[PDB]
From a paper:
Here we developed a comprehensive disulfide bond prediction algorithm that not just increased the success rate of predictions but also improved the quality of crystallized target proteins. We applied our method on two proteins which were previously determined to high resolution and frequently used as fusion partners for GPCR crystallization, cytochrome b562 (BRIL) and Flavodoxin, and verified our prediction by solving the crystal structures of the wild type (WT) proteins and mutants.
The continued disulfide omitted electron densities of the side chains suggested that the disulfide bonds are successfully formed in all crystallized mutants, which are T9C-A36C, A20C-Q25C, V16C-A29C, and K27C-A79C in BRIL and N14C-C93, A43C-L74C, and C102-R125C in Flavodoxin, respectively. The WT and disulfide engineered Flavodoxin structures were determined to high-resolution of 1.20–1.55 Å with B-factors in the range of 16.15–19.24 Å2.
Author numbering: 1 to 148
Write the structure that this text describes.
């Protein structure tokens, strides 16, 4: 009955597997889940019709914090997605060898807050292998549902 959208930007598959794991948790709890690669979406009205939106994005950049490339157009047009009043939470893969660990998650959360979204949980930051972190991912999904 409640509808969740998960949109992920992933280049090596880490954030995509994380998104799949979240989608299964939410669907087992009774949500209808639509999980979309950011490469396939357009920003205008993207969040319309959804009760919960989860945004996943890995972090990149040779010497600066950059978002995963398929997520950049969505971030640049986040003001047109329908985020005002929307229950959101963010997740992403990264590598703690880097100073700005999952820094894309911070950038997306900051812009969502300016846009009036309701961030329902602190962002999930996956370091290294996501299958190794599966219990952390499922637990975070449970906590997001519990904060609605
Ligand atoms: C050039 C480069 C820069 C990166 N910069 C960061 C970074 O600043 N912070 C971070 O947490 N991870 C950084 N990473 C690591 C990745 O985000 C990590 O490999 C991640 O697992 C990719 O997730 P994805 O498969 O979902 O795209 C960097 C990786 C590369 C190759």
């Amino acid at each position: 009955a409640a509808k969740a959208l998960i949109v992920y930007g992933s280049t090596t598959g880490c954030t995509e597997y994380t998104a799949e794991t979240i989608a299964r948790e939410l669907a087992d709890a009774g949500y209808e889940v639509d999980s979309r690669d950011a490469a396939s979406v357009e920003a205008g009205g993207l969040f319309e019709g959804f009760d919960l939106v989860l945004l996943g994005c890995s972090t990149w950049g040779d010497d600066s914090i950059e978002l995963q490339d398929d997520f950049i157009p969505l971030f640049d047009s986040l003001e047109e997605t329908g985020a005002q009043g929307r229950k959101v939470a963010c997740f992403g893969c990264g590598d703690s060898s880097w100073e700005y660990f999952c820094g894309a998650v911070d950038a997306i959360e900051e812009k969502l807050k300016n846009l009036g979204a309701e961030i329902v949980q602190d962002g999930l930051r996956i370091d290294g292998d996501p299958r190794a972190a599966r219990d952390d991912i499922v637990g975070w999904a449970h906590d997001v549902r519990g904060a609605i």
